[PDB]
Amino acid sequence: MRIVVWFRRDLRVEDNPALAAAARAGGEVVPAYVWSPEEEGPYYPGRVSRWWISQSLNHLDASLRRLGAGKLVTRRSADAAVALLQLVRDTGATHVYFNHLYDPISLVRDRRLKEMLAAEGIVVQSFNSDLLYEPWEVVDDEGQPFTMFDPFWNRCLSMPYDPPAPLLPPKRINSGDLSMCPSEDLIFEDESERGSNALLARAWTPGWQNADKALTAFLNGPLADYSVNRKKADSASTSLLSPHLHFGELSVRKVFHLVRMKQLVWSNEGNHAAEESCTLFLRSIGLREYSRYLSFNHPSSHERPLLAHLRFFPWVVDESYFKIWRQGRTGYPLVDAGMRELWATGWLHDRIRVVVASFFVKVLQLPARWGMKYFWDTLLDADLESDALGWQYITGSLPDGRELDRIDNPQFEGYKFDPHGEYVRRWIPELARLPTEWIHHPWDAPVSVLQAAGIELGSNYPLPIVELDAAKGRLQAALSEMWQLE
Amino acid sequence: MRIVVWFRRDLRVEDNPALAAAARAGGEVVPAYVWSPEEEGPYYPGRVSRWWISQSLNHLDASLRRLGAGKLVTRRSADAAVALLQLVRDTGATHVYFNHLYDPISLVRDRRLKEMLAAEGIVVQSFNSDLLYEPWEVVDDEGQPFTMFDPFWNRCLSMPYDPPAPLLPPKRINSGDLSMCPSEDLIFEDESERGSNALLARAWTPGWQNADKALTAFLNGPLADYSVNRKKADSASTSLLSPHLHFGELSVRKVFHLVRMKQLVWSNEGNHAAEESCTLFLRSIGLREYSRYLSFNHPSSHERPLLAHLRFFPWVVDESYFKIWRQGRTGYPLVDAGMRELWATGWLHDRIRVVVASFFVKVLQLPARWGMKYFWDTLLDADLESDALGWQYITGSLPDGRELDRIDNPQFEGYKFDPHGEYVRRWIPELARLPTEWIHHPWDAPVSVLQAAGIELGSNYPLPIVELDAAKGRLQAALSEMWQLE
Amino acid sequence: MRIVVWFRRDLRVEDNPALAAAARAGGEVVPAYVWSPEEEGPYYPGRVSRWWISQSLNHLDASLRRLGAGKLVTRRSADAAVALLQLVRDTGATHVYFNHLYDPISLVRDRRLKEMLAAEGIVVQSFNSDLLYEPWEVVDDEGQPFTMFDPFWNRCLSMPYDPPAPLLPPKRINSGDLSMCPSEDLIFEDESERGSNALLARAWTPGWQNADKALTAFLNGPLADYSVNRKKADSASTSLLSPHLHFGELSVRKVFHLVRMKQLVWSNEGNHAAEESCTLFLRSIGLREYSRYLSFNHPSSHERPLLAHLRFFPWVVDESYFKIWRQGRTGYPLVDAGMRELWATGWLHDRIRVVVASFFVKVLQLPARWGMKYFWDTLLDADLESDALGWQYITGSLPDGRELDRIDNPQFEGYKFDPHGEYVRRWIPELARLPTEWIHHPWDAPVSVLQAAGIELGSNYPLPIVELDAAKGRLQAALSEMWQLE
Amino acid sequence: MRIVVWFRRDLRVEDNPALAAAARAGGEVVPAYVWSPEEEGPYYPGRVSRWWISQSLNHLDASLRRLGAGKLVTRRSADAAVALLQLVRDTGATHVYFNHLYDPISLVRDRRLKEMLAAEGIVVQSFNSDLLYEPWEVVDDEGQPFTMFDPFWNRCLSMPYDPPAPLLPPKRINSGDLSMCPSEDLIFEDESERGSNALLARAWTPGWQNADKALTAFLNGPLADYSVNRKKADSASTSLLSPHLHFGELSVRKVFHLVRMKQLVWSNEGNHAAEESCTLFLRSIGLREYSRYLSFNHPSSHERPLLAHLRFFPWVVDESYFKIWRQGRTGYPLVDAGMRELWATGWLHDRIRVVVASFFVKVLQLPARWGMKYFWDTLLDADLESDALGWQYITGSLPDGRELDRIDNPQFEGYKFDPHGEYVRRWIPELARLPTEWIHHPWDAPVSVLQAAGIELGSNYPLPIVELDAAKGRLQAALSEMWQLE
Ligand SMILES: Cc1cc2nc3c(=O)[nH]c(=O)nc-3n(C[C@H](O)[C@H](O)[C@H](O)COP(=O)(O)OP(=O)(O)OC[C@H]3O[C@@H](n4cnc5c(N)ncnc54)[C@H](O)[C@@H]3O)c2cc1C
């Protein structure tokens, strides 16, 4: 009843530097979650990403009632600023203790939020939660922002001062009265998909308590061989904690500590593989930090994301091709098993997001905004930076890699990410007897080894809708339309 | 170089009562395997059942060379009797120590084999390996054979004398010379399927050494709850050792001992569930013993198997329906996941052989000899009795159960064998988001819960080729053709 | 109420070939245990060996009530023959189904028992339980008994016929009425040691159910390295099941089966160490079988045991020396830790029975009947053959080994049985800092390394009562009294 | 070659805030260990405490060479200040980066060290390593130090600001040249006890790498039931890490973090026992922090330790009584097993230091400086504060507990610390058969239960040198000499 913390994307109580700075403030703290998806514009957050919030908020209530604090109130309005001002009015609070995000749509909203509340009479203070450093204090030589990643992260490990350690969770807090503020339940998922969304719990359980159980099971397990099992998609040794790390159920400053703390343990035991796989796991953590630093600084993705160097190219406006690739009647088996895992789990491996999405533009030749709006709706780790950073990288625009005029060609795009075919036979079991040479290209197989395996192309497994040698040249008939104008 | 043992379907060295009776015979023993599939008539043994033999023979050689004995010679001819007489001629042997099988095609061959060898001058002696008792010494009240199972097996546990215990494996044997007999390698699998058959090793490894590893992993594991997990097909708690138990890699007299020996351990520990699941596991072992006793005695399946009370009914002669059911474009999802597991593993659960095969006759209305000849070609536990006993039982003819004029109706044929749908979503992952009420019948679902789950019937998942209410009456238009003639 | 089985030293229900031959006999069986220790003469069985029976009988009652059978009646009289005749009179039984033992005091009693019962009118039948073969059917070349062990056991593995396998335990039996026979409880242990005997349960739990738990924990565990950890006494890798194997709680025919059954498993896995340690474990089992065969056949230990080639030698008649060696104020540390383990556990390692008992005769020069009567009173595996076979062997009389005119000399009698000193420091912790060179001989140590370790000889740890160089010649002053008379 | 760190009692590299503040200082760092035990006066550190340093320094060299840094130089002189000034002269260093200890003998030495080096021209800076807070910033109400513990530690958990978290270990450091400074090996242990000290490695391995292996094995293990297994000495569930925590191989700020971090994990799982045993483990950690705060502040143990309210009382000057209690010929079995564990392991439980030391003064009536000088010589966790705080507490002088005019009386001083007698029978196995009522007092036993257990008092187990009812009044004849003078 003195200060408020309102969570936005930090759904945790361990080392949260707005709740722990509320416990030692002396007065009473009441928490909050204002839900306004109409403010976020075209980035109405997901459809299974909206499922994760409703099960993580209810996990946060029973984890924060045991520290005291009564409840976690949840209000709903069109914009945050009317609802948050009505919250300090209803409760009679003096401060607002939030922490700044780095979306280009919330950064304009946060200074607009700090402009409404401070002119009223209450005082606010922002903090730094889901980032190692802050993106304005990391600089290059003179004063500028970086424009690449490998010059950037070489400054990020060789800082003058180390990142601040995970500060202690609070001992106990107090709300005073749990009934002055009339909280209300609110819908997140639709009523037609009230039962079809509960089938994502076969692989994913949300909550902050399951975030550190998933972290510690990775440190003892697959971190010792992350340097070699990084690309292989058949085994689940790739630390499936990015939905925890996107919604702030796991702090980046704790994963940076515990990996570095046990890098020293393996460093003086002669394990040269397990110490190499710790500098390569923190590099991937730095890719998350670089995407937040990119949308805040100089490029900024100035008005909308999915933007670096295109949006003329003569795409086919065929909706039924978007009905085939979404369903998976595509014939190319590696982009077909990846398109079935995304629907069944709400999850893909990073190298399988490489081949599913690059097939969507370079072979199928569809507009890339149809690929984002489908990835945005059914995925769990669907943020505004990394979905914009990754689509930028795979379809080709950072001077980092994965250029155009280059189709996937799954003959050798599969022998690096899936050597034995344990990923194709897991997800399309109608292809489970092809002897691992034609499991990545059944249309290149002779008729004798196909009729022996029980696959008749056309009835059991569909033909490729677009041939590989066709779109190897049909792209260059369309990509030359860039190179006459730019 | 004195006596010969020739293995037929007892590919093991532990408690084999023809090899152990060859070690204590004093002289030298040479083993053999004569392969004549042209003698077996229409029962040319399998196509993946022929894969299991080629990998179990080579497992038997390296397991019997370490007892001595030099080699395991393998000859090939049209009939066994010319090849076996040429074997005692080439090696100068005096005895033949085999053990009698119980196929109606080998029982006529065995007395024909004993008729050729004894008239030459050499002496033979048969033994009893793959059976608990012998089928002529188990009798009913006066002198007759039984005609049912539950009167039969009540005599089989209440015998005057117990079955003979597993006699010790031999200490060491000797062949003398490993080069007098010019052995030859021989083909089992085709050259077109030399690589597609090696993909059954993802679930099955043959050999007698893996038979007791699979047995002991079941006694400590799923035997404690076999009485409740008997019908459920989603979990693999059903002791997958019938391909070991068909080819004689695991003796029935050892499984009867070790289950009964540890039934006593659980009997005086208060475990009333784990002692009930031992009388129900030996009952299923007795179903194997009853099928061998049935083809030898009174019914005998007199000239051919797949025979009890039919073969008029007006079947559709449509080959493309046999191309749909073999592939699995059938729409009924429970008989579709079962039709994909049979092709991927060469294995089905016993209650899934119930619903796949009864759909083949009572709904699709195809001739049952097309169902045997497909089951015979791709299955591992494809014998001559139990494939004939089971097709007789499920399609309805023993006074045991599973009568006609009764379709499967998977609305409640699935809630006993697959309660949560973990078996359908494992094998058809294009149906992985239906909320477990319409996972067994997608065509009975409303359009809203189907478009939310991403299934559009006709493109993603095919329609039912034959409706359920159609064949519920279209059978009775065809089954009345029995009841005017019989 | 038709036949009786009376247990003597076969306190088990698994593969007991008098109870299982009572179940299939048709009539009702009542079990019994007649306790007459006054018949056994000087071999009144033990004082902790009498503790093991009272806790194994009560374990047998609750293990045989669950098969039916009502009770296990226990009567007490001076001789067995009056009590057993009063038992068939009280119950009206027709047969007596026991199994013959091989003590020279029970073999004369058994034919005296068969002489009383058969002349009355009832019929008896003996069986073979606690032996592999029978000692009259194992012969040498012409017709004679053997006189050694290594010629004997070479016949015992190369028999014409294998030993009979473990026959199945009974399904269920029936006593009919549990109150016609007025059974009575009876004392085994004294009332002064009613509480001091319950402290042997810190290491030993009796019963037949714990016999196979102790057997299977050895087969998976220390049997793979029994060939190298056979002599080392510090680690408990030596299969502590001889108290189970003496009282018939574990059949010898089952241990011969399960070791031989899994010798084949390790034989075709390349484990040359684990297959050697199975031929050396069955050799030690054969030492138990040889001692039973020795007291029945030609030497017979004709009127009393502890007898092969002595009982003149001029022993000291000092009782206080027998008070020192029993207590352990002896100074020699290896025979002192062994004398403390025997009192604390009722158990010694076989190589520690070697050095404790040979020090008792060759150095202390006491009469050997004081050593048996002390070993008989406090030990668990105190039978009439192996206690007589072992004292015969270590003090020297079989042409097998461990001759006289040879003291122990623990300088190198310890570096084979206890290399690091983990056995001395476990049992005399007042010596726990001597640096493993003088842990086996503290009196041979300099004064500086003794005062640094905190041992002052005379107050903390006593001096040797008899010097080593004294009894190295004082024996030969007494052993020359043999060699003038024999 | 720019700054030096010299370790004193912080033998670790993880979160050491003088080495990590040396890595980010830019220049080159060389480490050091100056060994001057002649400066410490009567507190020449231990004889097995001197063994722990020689094996932890050599563990620190191979753990700090892999971070770079060349070596760890070790010089020896009479005082630290001549040797440390000769070290900055030999290497040409500019700074000295140490961290202040809290002994009253080093606190006078540290400001004397800062007085020599700063007047030369080099600059020093101290840090805070082995303490949670600093002892001058924890205050009571007005400005004073505390005089008790329970008022003190209630301020220590309710501080305004939390203790600083474990700061990251260094990435890599550099010495430049490893041969400019002529380092020398040095003796720690005597040559007479070069081999008797290596027998403490049966229970203790030193080093900082084994400190966190011992910590994490306690957090997963016995911390869940520390609240009930705190007093019981028979089981080793009491987190044996005080020799790691005394020599600075494990930071107190890390144990405070990891216990508090997983107190939250058990707090929201319903484990009310495992969350109570975390507030009671940090209390014991606070007892270490209170003893350091006590010798620095107001009482200070002004010129020497072992000092609070005595040193007149008429002690017996008998050296042979000090030869009995050191050896353990004392008859009282609970103080005898504790006196054998201290010699065998160099370790005692905290409640066994309670009864061994209080028997030394209140019953044996010896001067307490003979008890410290014996505890100082053979113990591992022999510091200057807690050895002074504990002797003060048990023999009675803090207003905390354990007053005088109160003997131990092991009849009920044993049924709280050793209920079954598993601690007495472990260490005096000559008493291993007493039936747990007279295992704590054999002289109070009747003769029948003693002769049955094999204990004859006087020869096997010695009599009590001082009777219990004697020193219950003979103390009060000597304690009245206090109460006439004070
Ligand atoms: C002086 C002396 C006295 C002995 N007194 C007894 C006694 O009272 N009771 C008794 O049962 N054994 C006795 N033995 C035999 C030997 O000590 C036992 O084998 C002992 O129990 C070893 O136990 P174990 O389980 O470690 O043997 P293991 O290594 O496990 O051997 C398994 C079995 O082998 C048998 N066995 C092995 N070695 C011998 C042997 N040398 N003689 C006889 N059997 C053997 C035992 O019955 C044992 O159950 C005595 C030996 C000596 C030298």
mmCIF file of N, CA and C and ligand atoms in Angstrom, chain C residues 204 218 226 230 237-246 280-281 283-289 291-292 347-351 353-354 357-358 375-376 379-395, ligand 1:
data_model
loop_
_atom_site.group_PDB
_atom_site.id
_atom_site.type_symbol
_atom_site.label_atom_id
_atom_site.label_comp_id
_atom_site.label_asym_id
_atom_site.label_seq_id
_atom_site.Cartn_x
_atom_site.Cartn_y
_atom_site.Cartn_z
ATOM 1 N N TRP C 204 24.098 -59.646 11.006
ATOM 2 C CA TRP C 204 23.521 -60.903 10.542
ATOM 3 C C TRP C 204 22.021 -60.895 10.787
ATOM 4 N N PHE C 218 25.501 -61.049 -4.251
ATOM 5 C CA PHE C 218 26.881 -61.453 -4.478
ATOM 6 C C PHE C 218 27.139 -61.761 -5.946
ATOM 7 N N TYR C 226 36.095 -62.261 -7.575
ATOM 8 C CA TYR C 226 36.378 -63.186 -6.491
ATOM 9 C C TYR C 226 37.755 -63.814 -6.628
ATOM 10 N N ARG C 230 39.966 -62.798 -2.998
ATOM 11 C CA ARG C 230 39.674 -63.979 -2.201
ATOM 12 C C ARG C 230 40.422 -63.946 -0.877
ATOM 13 N N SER C 237 34.135 -58.553 0.485
ATOM 14 C CA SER C 237 33.811 -59.182 -0.795
ATOM 15 C C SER C 237 34.124 -60.672 -0.789
ATOM 16 N N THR C 238 33.461 -61.456 0.056
ATOM 17 C CA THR C 238 33.749 -62.884 0.111
ATOM 18 C C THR C 238 32.484 -63.707 0.335
ATOM 19 N N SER C 239 31.316 -63.127 0.023
ATOM 20 C CA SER C 239 30.015 -63.815 -0.046
ATOM 21 C C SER C 239 29.614 -64.437 1.291
ATOM 22 N N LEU C 240 29.302 -63.567 2.244
ATOM 23 C CA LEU C 240 29.036 -63.990 3.613
ATOM 24 C C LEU C 240 27.723 -64.757 3.716
ATOM 25 N N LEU C 241 27.698 -65.997 3.229
ATOM 26 C CA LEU C 241 26.485 -66.796 3.264
ATOM 27 C C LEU C 241 26.699 -68.194 3.811
ATOM 28 N N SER C 242 27.831 -68.460 4.457
ATOM 29 C CA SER C 242 28.017 -69.759 5.091
ATOM 30 C C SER C 242 27.116 -70.042 6.301
ATOM 31 N N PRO C 243 26.645 -69.073 7.111
ATOM 32 C CA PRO C 243 25.594 -69.444 8.075
ATOM 33 C C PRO C 243 24.262 -69.773 7.434
ATOM 34 N N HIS C 244 23.970 -69.208 6.265
ATOM 35 C CA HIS C 244 22.793 -69.643 5.524
ATOM 36 C C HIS C 244 23.003 -71.034 4.949
ATOM 37 N N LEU C 245 24.224 -71.328 4.514
ATOM 38 C CA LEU C 245 24.496 -72.576 3.822
ATOM 39 C C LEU C 245 24.744 -73.722 4.796
ATOM 40 N N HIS C 246 24.904 -73.429 6.086
ATOM 41 C CA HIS C 246 25.098 -74.491 7.065
ATOM 42 C C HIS C 246 23.769 -74.989 7.606
ATOM 43 N N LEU C 280 36.521 -70.962 -9.354
ATOM 44 C CA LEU C 280 37.189 -70.884 -8.067
ATOM 45 C C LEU C 280 36.204 -70.660 -6.930
ATOM 46 N N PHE C 281 34.988 -70.217 -7.232
ATOM 47 C CA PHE C 281 33.907 -70.180 -6.258
ATOM 48 C C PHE C 281 33.238 -71.534 -6.092
ATOM 49 N N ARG C 283 34.860 -74.300 -6.496
ATOM 50 C CA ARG C 283 35.847 -75.100 -5.783
ATOM 51 C C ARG C 283 35.650 -74.985 -4.282
ATOM 52 N N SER C 284 35.388 -73.770 -3.797
ATOM 53 C CA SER C 284 35.143 -73.570 -2.374
ATOM 54 C C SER C 284 33.833 -74.201 -1.938
ATOM 55 N N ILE C 285 32.828 -74.212 -2.816
ATOM 56 C CA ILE C 285 31.597 -74.951 -2.546
ATOM 57 C C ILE C 285 31.889 -76.446 -2.468
ATOM 58 N N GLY C 286 32.820 -76.922 -3.295
ATOM 59 C CA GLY C 286 33.241 -78.310 -3.232
ATOM 60 C C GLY C 286 34.014 -78.676 -1.983
ATOM 61 N N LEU C 287 34.639 -77.697 -1.325
ATOM 62 C CA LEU C 287 35.265 -77.957 -0.032
ATOM 63 C C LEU C 287 34.230 -78.244 1.043
ATOM 64 N N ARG C 288 33.039 -77.661 0.923
ATOM 65 C CA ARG C 288 31.956 -78.014 1.831
ATOM 66 C C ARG C 288 31.464 -79.427 1.556
ATOM 67 N N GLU C 289 31.401 -79.805 0.279
ATOM 68 C CA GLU C 289 30.925 -81.132 -0.094
ATOM 69 C C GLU C 289 31.947 -82.204 0.255
ATOM 70 N N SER C 291 34.045 -82.179 2.884
ATOM 71 C CA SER C 291 34.066 -82.421 4.322
ATOM 72 C C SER C 291 32.921 -83.320 4.759
ATOM 73 N N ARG C 292 31.761 -83.208 4.109
ATOM 74 C CA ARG C 292 30.652 -84.109 4.403
ATOM 75 C C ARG C 292 30.950 -85.516 3.910
ATOM 76 N N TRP C 347 31.846 -64.101 13.511
ATOM 77 C CA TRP C 347 32.240 -64.353 12.137
ATOM 78 C C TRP C 347 33.711 -64.028 11.964
ATOM 79 N N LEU C 348 34.410 -64.850 11.192
ATOM 80 C CA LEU C 348 35.763 -64.542 10.769
ATOM 81 C C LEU C 348 35.950 -64.889 9.301
ATOM 82 N N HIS C 349 36.858 -64.169 8.652
ATOM 83 C CA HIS C 349 37.298 -64.530 7.313
ATOM 84 C C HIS C 349 38.089 -65.830 7.373
ATOM 85 N N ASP C 350 38.162 -66.529 6.238
ATOM 86 C CA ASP C 350 38.782 -67.852 6.225
ATOM 87 C C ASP C 350 40.293 -67.768 6.412
ATOM 88 N N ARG C 351 40.930 -66.750 5.841
ATOM 89 C CA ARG C 351 42.353 -66.540 6.078
ATOM 90 C C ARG C 351 42.648 -65.931 7.442
ATOM 91 N N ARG C 353 40.779 -67.052 10.192
ATOM 92 C CA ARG C 353 40.768 -68.300 10.950
ATOM 93 C C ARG C 353 42.071 -69.072 10.784
ATOM 94 N N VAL C 354 42.803 -68.807 9.703
ATOM 95 C CA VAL C 354 44.124 -69.381 9.472
ATOM 96 C C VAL C 354 45.129 -68.881 10.506
ATOM 97 N N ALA C 357 44.015 -69.293 14.661
ATOM 98 C CA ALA C 357 44.069 -70.635 15.225
ATOM 99 C C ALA C 357 45.468 -71.227 15.164
ATOM 100 N N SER C 358 46.262 -70.882 14.150
ATOM 101 C CA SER C 358 47.609 -71.437 14.088
ATOM 102 C C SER C 358 48.534 -70.761 15.086
ATOM 103 N N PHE C 375 35.848 -72.145 19.731
ATOM 104 C CA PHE C 375 35.296 -71.859 18.407
ATOM 105 C C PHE C 375 33.888 -72.415 18.261
ATOM 106 N N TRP C 376 33.606 -73.542 18.916
ATOM 107 C CA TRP C 376 32.278 -74.138 18.833
ATOM 108 C C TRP C 376 31.237 -73.273 19.523
ATOM 109 N N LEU C 379 30.592 -68.944 17.290
ATOM 110 C CA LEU C 379 30.730 -68.910 15.839
ATOM 111 C C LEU C 379 29.381 -69.304 15.264
ATOM 112 N N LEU C 380 29.106 -68.868 14.038
ATOM 113 C CA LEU C 380 27.814 -69.181 13.441
ATOM 114 C C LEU C 380 27.898 -70.413 12.545
ATOM 115 N N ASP C 381 28.973 -70.537 11.777
ATOM 116 C CA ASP C 381 29.172 -71.644 10.843
ATOM 117 C C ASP C 381 29.985 -72.791 11.454
ATOM 118 N N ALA C 382 29.458 -73.226 12.605
ATOM 119 C CA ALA C 382 30.076 -74.219 13.473
ATOM 120 C C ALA C 382 29.391 -75.560 13.270
ATOM 121 N N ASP C 383 29.829 -76.299 12.261
ATOM 122 C CA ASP C 383 29.325 -77.634 12.003
ATOM 123 C C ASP C 383 30.289 -78.667 12.558
ATOM 124 N N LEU C 384 30.010 -79.922 12.236
ATOM 125 C CA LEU C 384 30.807 -80.998 12.788
ATOM 126 C C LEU C 384 31.881 -81.458 11.810
ATOM 127 N N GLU C 385 31.709 -81.193 10.513
ATOM 128 C CA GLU C 385 32.690 -81.608 9.515
ATOM 129 C C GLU C 385 33.719 -80.524 9.226
ATOM 130 N N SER C 386 33.261 -79.326 8.855
ATOM 131 C CA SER C 386 34.188 -78.302 8.387
ATOM 132 C C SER C 386 34.995 -77.705 9.527
ATOM 133 N N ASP C 387 34.435 -77.675 10.739
ATOM 134 C CA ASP C 387 35.231 -77.307 11.903
ATOM 135 C C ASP C 387 36.265 -78.381 12.194
ATOM 136 N N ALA C 388 35.926 -79.637 11.909
ATOM 137 C CA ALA C 388 36.897 -80.713 12.011
ATOM 138 C C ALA C 388 37.815 -80.786 10.801
ATOM 139 N N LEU C 389 37.333 -80.438 9.606
ATOM 140 C CA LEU C 389 38.197 -80.448 8.428
ATOM 141 C C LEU C 389 39.185 -79.293 8.465
ATOM 142 N N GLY C 390 38.742 -78.138 8.964
ATOM 143 C CA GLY C 390 39.577 -76.949 8.904
ATOM 144 C C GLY C 390 40.682 -76.947 9.940
ATOM 145 N N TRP C 391 40.355 -77.339 11.177
ATOM 146 C CA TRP C 391 41.352 -77.477 12.234
ATOM 147 C C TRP C 391 42.379 -78.529 11.881
ATOM 148 N N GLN C 392 41.938 -79.587 11.211
ATOM 149 C CA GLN C 392 42.829 -80.572 10.621
ATOM 150 C C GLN C 392 43.750 -79.960 9.576
ATOM 151 N N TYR C 393 43.256 -79.016 8.773
ATOM 152 C CA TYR C 393 44.066 -78.473 7.687
ATOM 153 C C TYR C 393 45.031 -77.395 8.146
ATOM 154 N N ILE C 394 44.583 -76.456 8.981
ATOM 155 C CA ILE C 394 45.435 -75.319 9.313
ATOM 156 C C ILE C 394 46.535 -75.701 10.288
ATOM 157 N N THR C 395 46.274 -76.644 11.179
ATOM 158 C CA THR C 395 47.218 -77.073 12.195
ATOM 159 C C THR C 395 47.900 -78.339 11.706
HETATM 160 C C1 LIG E 1 40.232 -73.374 11.640
HETATM 161 C C2 LIG E 1 39.026 -73.370 10.740
HETATM 162 C C3 LIG E 1 37.761 -73.510 11.294
HETATM 163 C C4 LIG E 1 36.623 -73.509 10.494
HETATM 164 N N1 LIG E 1 35.403 -73.647 11.102
HETATM 165 C C5 LIG E 1 34.352 -73.647 10.368
HETATM 166 C C6 LIG E 1 33.079 -73.797 11.029
HETATM 167 O O1 LIG E 1 32.959 -73.923 12.240
HETATM 168 N N2 LIG E 1 31.984 -73.769 10.189
HETATM 169 C C7 LIG E 1 32.051 -73.651 8.801
HETATM 170 O O2 LIG E 1 31.009 -73.665 8.142
HETATM 171 N N3 LIG E 1 33.264 -73.510 8.187
HETATM 172 C C8 LIG E 1 34.348 -73.510 8.939
HETATM 173 N N4 LIG E 1 35.574 -73.350 8.332
HETATM 174 C C9 LIG E 1 35.626 -73.213 6.863
HETATM 175 C C10 LIG E 1 35.735 -71.766 6.371
HETATM 176 O O3 LIG E 1 36.193 -70.886 7.396
HETATM 177 C C11 LIG E 1 34.378 -71.290 5.858
HETATM 178 O O4 LIG E 1 34.400 -71.420 4.445
HETATM 179 C C12 LIG E 1 34.052 -69.831 6.171
HETATM 180 O O5 LIG E 1 32.688 -69.751 6.580
HETATM 181 C C13 LIG E 1 34.277 -68.911 4.991
HETATM 182 O O6 LIG E 1 33.052 -68.196 4.728
HETATM 183 P P1 LIG E 1 32.801 -67.460 3.361
HETATM 184 O O7 LIG E 1 31.285 -67.301 3.225
HETATM 185 O O8 LIG E 1 33.571 -66.227 3.261
HETATM 186 O O9 LIG E 1 33.297 -68.493 2.278
HETATM 187 P P2 LIG E 1 33.117 -68.359 0.710
HETATM 188 O O10 LIG E 1 34.358 -67.842 0.099
HETATM 189 O O11 LIG E 1 31.837 -67.606 0.443
HETATM 190 O O12 LIG E 1 32.822 -69.805 0.257
HETATM 191 C C14 LIG E 1 31.473 -70.245 0.001
HETATM 192 C C15 LIG E 1 31.258 -71.509 0.784
HETATM 193 O O13 LIG E 1 32.426 -72.329 0.657
HETATM 194 C C16 LIG E 1 32.572 -73.136 1.799
HETATM 195 N N5 LIG E 1 33.993 -73.200 2.101
HETATM 196 C C17 LIG E 1 34.971 -72.391 1.587
HETATM 197 N N6 LIG E 1 36.176 -72.669 2.019
HETATM 198 C C18 LIG E 1 35.978 -73.746 2.866
HETATM 199 C C19 LIG E 1 36.862 -74.516 3.643
HETATM 200 N N7 LIG E 1 38.180 -74.308 3.691
HETATM 201 N N8 LIG E 1 36.339 -75.520 4.380
HETATM 202 C C20 LIG E 1 35.022 -75.734 4.336
HETATM 203 N N9 LIG E 1 34.091 -75.073 3.645
HETATM 204 C C21 LIG E 1 34.638 -74.090 2.923
HETATM 205 C C22 LIG E 1 31.709 -72.540 2.914
HETATM 206 O O14 LIG E 1 30.719 -73.467 3.337
HETATM 207 C C23 LIG E 1 31.074 -71.298 2.278
HETATM 208 O O15 LIG E 1 29.680 -71.273 2.540
HETATM 209 C C24 LIG E 1 36.758 -73.369 9.106
HETATM 210 C C25 LIG E 1 38.025 -73.233 8.548
HETATM 211 C C26 LIG E 1 39.160 -73.225 9.351
HETATM 212 C C27 LIG E 1 40.514 -73.072 8.715
#
